[PDB]
Design a protein around this ligand. Structure first.
Ligand SMILES: [Zn+2]
Ligand SMILES: [Zn+2]
Length: 291
């Protein structure tokens, strides 16, 4: 698909270039990453005996038999999140961004903190019903906004945010998941969380339309699902920092019945939404914020 001759002010072409490069290096960075492969082998061996392991240790194919499922899963996820719109989608996105609500006020941290907190509470009845939970989530959000302002996002910031967004769990809880819709493996998720941080930062440096970046970050953070818990909470806060830094109102969630579509589903049928379709829907949902 050639985009050169399409008119573009979102720097959607830069975005597409970013994705092209990441996608082109996906095999090397993920599928052929030895930490990914060894974890995959270790995880696979858990199910198997208990007898059959040492047995098949001598089988030439074994090191691969152990990793074929995990590889397929990551390739599937990558296919779903990689941004490559049709000409019709490219243009639809162009028009849709023009219609987005955007404030002119230079909102302060307290204002941003409250907007993100309220947006989070809207996506959860438990938060709405538990004042003490809402308040401690608000604090984690404030800390995150405070520490990340005018600074490059880091994985460490996201780790601290995830931890802060889980006050409803005892301490000593797992930060990253150790095991597992179909989400990335633990290591694949860690690798690609770091890549997503890179994406967020580079997109800002290249002035790629924040609303589209937010949509893409939303989808892939949910697909990767790196943490033991609080992935939804964390993704929504990160996406909303991206949006609010650009002057957009906070995003809450997709409709009750499009949310399932944005990542690969184990279930055969189940409408699967493509990356472009997710961006289009995200932008539409966002444009309804004013109403
Ligand atoms: Zn802790
Ligand atoms: Zn605002």
């Amino acid at each position: 698909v050639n985009y050169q001759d399409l008119e573009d002010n979102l720097n959607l072409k830069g975005l597409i270039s970013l994705e092209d490069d990441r996608n082109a290096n996906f095999e090397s960075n993920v599928l052929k990453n030895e930490k990914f492969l060894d974890e995959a082998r270790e995880i696979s061996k858990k199910s198997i005996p208990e007898a059959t392991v040492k047995q098949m240790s001598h089988l030439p194919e074994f090191d691969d038999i152990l990793t074929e499922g995990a590889k397929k899963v990551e390739s599937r996820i990558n296919k779903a999140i990689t941004f490559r719109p049709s000409v019709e989608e490219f243009s639809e996105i162009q028009d849709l961004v023009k219609t987005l609500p955007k404030t002119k006020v230079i909102e302060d941290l307290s204002t941003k903190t409250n907007e993100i907190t309220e947006a989070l509470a809207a996506t959860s009845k438990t938060i709405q019903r538990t004042p003490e939970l809402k308040e401690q989530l608000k604090t984690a959000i404030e800390d995150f906004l405070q520490n990340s302002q005018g600074k490059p996002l880091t994985v460490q910031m996201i780790e601290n945010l995830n931890h802060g967004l889980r006050p409803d769990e005892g301490e000593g809880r797992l930060l990253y998941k150790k095991e597992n819709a179909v989400f990335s493996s633990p290591e694949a998720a860690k690798i690609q969380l770091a890549e997503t941080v890179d994406f967020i930062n580079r997109a800002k440096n290249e002035g790629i339309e924040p609303s589209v970046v937010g949509a893409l970050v939303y989808q892939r953070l949910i697909a990767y699902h790196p943490f033991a818990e609080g992935n939804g909470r964390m993704a929504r806060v990160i996406v909303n920092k991206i949006l609010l830094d650009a002057g957009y109102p906070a995003f809450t969630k997709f409709s009750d019945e499009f949310e399932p579509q944005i990542i690969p589903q184990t279930k055969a049928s189940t409408k699967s939404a493509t990356s472009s379709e997710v961006v289009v829907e995200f932008l539409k949902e966002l444009a309804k914020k004013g109403s």
